[PDB]
Write a protein that binds this DNA or RNA. Structure first.
Ligand SMILES: [Mn+2]
Lengths: 343, 100, 218, 346, 343, 98, 342
DNA sequence: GGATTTTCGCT
DNA sequence: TTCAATCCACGCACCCATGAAGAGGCGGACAGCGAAAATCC
DNA sequence: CGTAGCTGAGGACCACCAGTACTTTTTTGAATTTTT
DNA sequence: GTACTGGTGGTCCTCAGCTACGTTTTTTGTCGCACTCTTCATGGGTGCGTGGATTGAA
């Protein structure tokens, strides 16, 4: 719960946060489930329909601690704090760096380096896992291509180049990607892609996964103090959470497509739940989406290890913590922002 | 005044004590006299000022205090554009041709 | 001489006759009546606060209500609403009860005290009635005002007695020629209850013999 | 409202047959073989009119008589079958004055002067209102000639002395006004052409509406006159035929012209009624129709709520009160507060 | 049930009434109880909560018969009439006669002669009935005086003289009245008349009787259309029914004083029911008043004969029938007003 | 603005599925306004919120079975509303001290 | 627009705020004290230890209703702040206008101009009604010298200058404040605006009102979408939360000092309504607090006319409009901020 | 053949 | 010789349907990406 | 803990059903610190 | 026929308690730019009481 990052991540539902002396007590239906100190904490994030003992609220407000309250899954409910601390300077720095282009180019190249690393290693593991019926040398050649592209992105200096190399990578990815899935390959795959109302079932279910990750990343930004609607690589525009999209593109790897292949394989999803209305639209059936959301929650419960921090956690905390490091970049404690990087 | 207002009355007596059925029956009879009913436990009636004063006096002398409730609403003169009906409980209107 | 006693006039008529001077005329000659809000209030208080058949023998004072009174000097019948007997040595005894006391009449209205006559007049008449029955010395009188919930005492002087005697004579004279009179309407005479028949605008307007020939020229 | 004379309470017309008017406290209830058809508070009524066979419980009539709520019974065509009349009240001054005055022929003339003067003024002024707004229609000069005729006659009527003379002049004015009353069918076909008078059977149209209007106006004038305190069956004019509402006829002689037949002409000219509604039996004179009756009564009760300004009293009052205030302006002349009774000179 | 002088009174309560053919029919819960022809009736008077029948209402109102509905105790409720209403010439005749001395004195003579005859005959009857407890000489002397006084009043022509004779007759009867009581003289003693604030017991009782009788007679007049407030002997003043007081002189003694003396002598009540007042006034108790009313109602059902016409009828119809005769005097074939000369 | 309107409802709860309708109508009509009496609510609303409430409430009820009346007073209701009994209700213009 | 909405005060300790649909309900060990609809509330203030249901905080934060927690003597604690709702260009403009001394000194010029104008004109008004109690002459004196400073403030281009002038307006007015009182001078410990945060009588009211205003203006500004308690004008020093009240410094002197003085002069508060602790702190009685809050709401309800267009406006809208205009200036439609000048 | 131009599905 | 009620225009006090601003999101018209696939030379 | 569904156990409202009844004084009562 | 008093039963409303969950979000190149939604403020009616000119008397 209490990560090395100075936040509290109470996620279990129905856990009453309360106050004993100078420490927080997590009550689990009227017995002392947990006890934590408050001497080195900086912010508290609370999931679940719960409460806080007003004594804890009063003790947190004075000594520069913000109490953020969200629901179980995630949809920024509210924030409690006195004279606001740690938002004005952070947001002003965000806007100042948004004005200039050199730092924006640096951050965007960092993000793209992370994405290409993730995809290349994903292909490496995919060809290692099942070396029976797969084009191993083709995937190796693509791996060398993306290694050179990773070096070039690390050698980038301007935006235009960035957007361009982005487009390129994207086409290449679609191309190779069709040949990746193992089971049910003869079902309903993709030869075409739409960033708009989709055709093919796989593209639509990617769209749904993207929307879920969208809501998650938006809440991830909102819980720390940064904006939503001005981005670094994506240009500013009214109504579009550009920073959200930038982080989406950074994390569109393991967290989205691996879930796609897992749902498609293992015969956990069938073709009876997918439909078609005159334009390729895949109207998700209610049972299909119920199973999808249950599987998403189950996956979120899966334990992994952070590549950078090293601390064991859930999948559901992977975005927020990652986004939180972004804050520690804008506060001057970090030199860069590696999501998945060697350095 | 002599404006012929459309006053509304809401009575709420208690029948869980010694002052039950007698009070409820007497209040119902003394309120139905000056107007028709539109819903169970509510009344509307067209009244001048003197009849309204007599009615309010009679009811405030009839019910027992500290155990009941009685509310009087005075819409005014131009009432025909304020009453709004939705359901299926028709009520006669006495400022119309009124043919049977 | 029952017919001589028959020709008596109600006391409230004498109270009204110190007013618009047609209210009494309408109410006792044409036999008409209406009801405003204030009339309802006054009638309700008079009914509620008065019940016969009961007496209160407290000892400090004896209060009796709804007592009929019949004065012959003024030919006035009425019902006194409050009579208070108070212990005294020089007072006259009351019939049917041992001891001697002094009698004070009290009548209670509704409303703020009136700056002019009206009420006081009626109260004086009260005393005279008792003067013709208990034949004693009634030189005091209390009025019980309800809108302020208090009492005011008014001494009785012989000037008021002459006033009420002459007033009663004229008010009794008006029956001989049943002629309802007229008086300036003023703005006060609005909250009259008999206005629906009183018609103030019909008293100080031009004659019809002008209007009916004027609009007839065309 | 200043004078705020009264308030024009409503009125109940029951048409469905075989009902029964019962009383529950202050409510009038319409029962029909134990089936309840409705109930109305009786403080919001003025008169209750019954059609066909409608019986009344003695308690109901006894309650309605004492609060000047009149009850009337009609068979099919507004006949005078039966009304209700209550007790007498103790206001002997007005009744003694009225009886003594009616015993004196000179005062009879001094009142009938104003009655007929108001009547002829009503006729003339309404004729001129009709002429000046319908240019292209009838001889725009025959109406005018009748107008100065009536202006001539009126001043002479003002100066009458005996009842027979006033009756003669009233008849002259009546014929000289019917002569042009026959001329208004402006916006309807020939079936609404006046062709004289028939008394007991309404053998034609127009009569079948004028009869209804006259009955519904008489039953209002009588109620107003008995409300004010007078007795309504002895008169200042007419031959005193026994047992007829003579004073009601006298007081209606003024608002009949401007309040009933003007209404029928307005009803016809607006084409609110169609000749298909009426029908006829083997002889059957002319009988109106149930939807036709409903339309007549709806238009009547709708017009009875127009607000005017009264000429003499100078107040803004509703149309239906006019037959009341006039009567009130009448029974006070009797106490001498005026000089002579001002008739309605709309 | 009974038809007297072309009128029809239905005195028994709870009997519906309807029309059949051209006849009136009485009913009592679907039981045929009476049939009467309507060829030669003049009015209908009801006493029950009947309601009549609308067929008969229309029939009579068309055939110039008015209906009057009362209550079972005689109070006036309503009057159904058509155009006629009947009483117009009668009321005009009353009003014309009310303002002349000759005719008013004639009718006053008619009333007073009946009064003195009834008083004298009652005195002589009581002398005859009881020997021992009577000063016979005083009563016989007063009887001779009253006979001469009646013969004199028969020839009066001026109002003042008739008023004086009435006063003298009243003085004689009053100075005789006290010894009429033959039981419970302890507190029941008559020593004068004081109508307003009545004093000392029995006086109040007498007053009450008069009131009831007056009201009864009042309703009687309203049955036929006589204007109850314009008298003949008594002069008219607003608020008082002068003609009722004129009429109820002849019926005052035999019908009120006899009733009171019967109550006193038969020990029907005791003085415990009268409360006290400080000035000497006397009032009645609710229980005593109700017993008095019940006794009056029961006595009203006594059945006697009619001295002038002979039909055997109840006491309660005496005030009406007489009143009817009064009406038949004003416009009819009556030579002179017939008093209630009852031995 | 700031109209003090009155809402009364009589829902037939014993025909086929009444209880659900009654519960939903009660909660919906308590969302806006305040409780005064059994089957009598009062609310302090503007025109737009009142129209939205009427549109939301006309669908939860089922017509031809129940009744629902809406009355409106104006801007100076303090002269109009009068109370005599023992069911006090707060007026949402007071200092509101708890 | 936005006709002033109500506000809910809770004092009794150990209650609980809970949500039900759109109603806020108060409980205390499952005892429903009352429920209020939330569509006609503007803010919610709580004393003592009162908790809220996280659904309620989410609802209020989403729908622009401000929750504030307080303790005994208005010691501010735990404001409820929501999220970023959009209009990003307005925030861009406001963030660019800061850290540039020209526009900053223009806005400081207008702010302190409004403050000085209000103080001077209020002092002249008070010496205009009743001249017998005090010395008119000296009062008039102060007037012109403040007028003098007015010309100076308009001929200003540097922020570092104005702070110094602040001290002048902070030392050329205190000398009048002690003479502001009329009645009950001897009882009410009246050492002028000589203040002590740990409380030394009289200033209890001062602090209370200060904090009260601070919350109203903060909510009014956040409704439009900007934060200015430490912004372009006020110093960068943390913990000096006054610029949000400096937007209403123009009012801070007017609407709070005037309220305190009116209560004192109208003899409506008695000296028995206060007390002091053992150590020396000063607190207010509960009945006095209820009286103060009733008076504050009743005053905030009263209706006046705005100088700009004259559309008839209410007092609680005085902060809100001052926020709204600050938007329209940053959109470039006007030339410079028109402050509130009475 | 070779600039090159268009065609063409992704940021 | 000034007068003494009467109508009569007359203003005045709010209400209401609706027509025009800020925040908001919508598709189009150029930006682009690199291949390719010729397109042509 | 807020949002829905589900029962339950009551206090309110009203429509009927049945049983023993049915007449009373006279005088009183408001008004420009608002009265449509 | 009504007005008054008992009793019976069927039908409306609100709290209490138990059971299971809680919320379901079909893209995102940039640039002005013609469109839409939502929400605040006005030139028409519609009264509703009132002083200003008009003359027949004392
Ligand atoms: Mn009294």
């Amino acid at each position: 719960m209490k990560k090395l990052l100075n936040t509290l991540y109470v996620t279990q539902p129905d856990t009453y946060l309360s106050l004993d002396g100078d420490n927080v007590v997590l009550l689990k239906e009227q017995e002392k489930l947990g006890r934590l100190p408050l001497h080195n904490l900086e912010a508290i994030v609370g999931f679940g329909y719960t409460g806080a003992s007003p004594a804890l609220m009063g003790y947190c407000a004075e000594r520069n601690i913000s109490i953020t309250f969200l629901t179980k899954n995630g949809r920024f409910l509210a924030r409690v704090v006195g004279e606001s601390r740690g938002n004005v300077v952070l947001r002003k720095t965000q806007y100042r760096i948004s004005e200039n282009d050199q730092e924006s180019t640096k951050i965007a190249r960092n993000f793209i380096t992370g994405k290409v690393y993730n995809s290349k290693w994903m292909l490496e593991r995919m060809t290692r896992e099942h070396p029976l019926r797969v084009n191993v040398e083709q995937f190796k050649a693509t791996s060398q291509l993306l290694s050179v592209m990773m070096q070039e992105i690390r050698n980038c200096d301007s935006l235009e180049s960035l957007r361009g190399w982005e487009g390129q990578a994207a086409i290449n990815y679609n191309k190779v990607f069709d040949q990746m899935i193992l089971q049910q390959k003869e079902e309903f795959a993709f030869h075409g892609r739409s960033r708009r109302p989709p055709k093919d079932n796989v593209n639509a279910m990617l769209s749904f996964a993207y929307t879920l990750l969208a809501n998650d990343v938006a809440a991830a930004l909102e819980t720390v103090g940064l904006d939503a609607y001005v981005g670094f690589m994506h240009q500013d525009r009214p109504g579009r959470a550009s920073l959200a999209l930038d982080l989406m593109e950074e994390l569109r790897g393991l967290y989205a497509d691996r879930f796609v292949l897992s749902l498609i394989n293992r015969k956990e999803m069938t073709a009876d739940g997918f439909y078609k209305k005159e334009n390729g639209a895949v109207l998700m059936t209610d049972e299909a989406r119920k199973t999808f959301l249950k599987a998403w929650q189950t996956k979120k419960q899966e334990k992994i290890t952070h590549p950078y921090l090293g601390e064991k956690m859930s999948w559901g905390l992977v975005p927020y913590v990652q986004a939180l490091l972004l804050a520690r970049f804008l506060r001057g404690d970090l030199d860069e922002y590696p999501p998945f990087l060697w350095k | 005044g002599a404006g012929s207002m459309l006053v509304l009355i809401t009575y709420d007596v208690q029948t869980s004590s010694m002052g039950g059925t007698k009070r409820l029956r007497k209040v119902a009879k003394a309120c139905q006299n000056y107007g028709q009913r539109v819903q169970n436990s509510v009344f509307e009636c067209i009244v001048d000022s003197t009849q309204l004063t007599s009615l309010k006096l009679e009811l405030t002398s009839l019910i027992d205090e500290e155990k009941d409730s009685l509310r009087i609403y005075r819409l005014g003169n131009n009432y025909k554009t304020k009453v709004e009906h939705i359901g299926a409980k028709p009520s006669i209107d006495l400022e119309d041709p009124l043919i049977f | 001489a029952s017919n001589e006693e028959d020709r008596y006039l109600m006391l409230s008529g004498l109270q009204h006759f110190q007013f618009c001077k047609r209210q009494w005329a309408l109410i006792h000659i044409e036999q008409q009546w209406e009801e405003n809000v204030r009339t309802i209030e006054g009638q309700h208080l008079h009914k509620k606060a008065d019940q016969p058949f009961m007496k209160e023998k407290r000892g400090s004072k004896l209060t009796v209500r709804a007592m009929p009174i019949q004065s012959k000097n003024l030919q006035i019948s009425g019902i006194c609403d409050v009579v208070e007997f108070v212990q005294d040595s020089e007072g006259i005894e009351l019939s049917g009860v041992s001891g001697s006391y002094k009698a004070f009449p009290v009548e209670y209205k509704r409303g703020k005290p009136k700056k002019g006559d009206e009420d006081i007049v009626q109260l004086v008449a009260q005393a005279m009635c008792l003067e013709e029955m208990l034949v004693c010395r009634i030189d005091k009188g209390y009025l019980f005002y309800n809108e302020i919930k208090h009492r005011v005492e008014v001494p009785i002087t012989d000037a008021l007695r002459d006033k009420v005697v002459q007033m009663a004579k004229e008010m009794h004279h008006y029956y001989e020629n049943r002629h309802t009179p007229k008086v300036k309407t003023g703005p006060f005479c609005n909250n009259c209850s008999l206005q629906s028949i009183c018609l103030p605008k019909l008293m100080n307007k031009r004659s019809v013999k002008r209007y009916i020939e004027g609009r007839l020229s065309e």
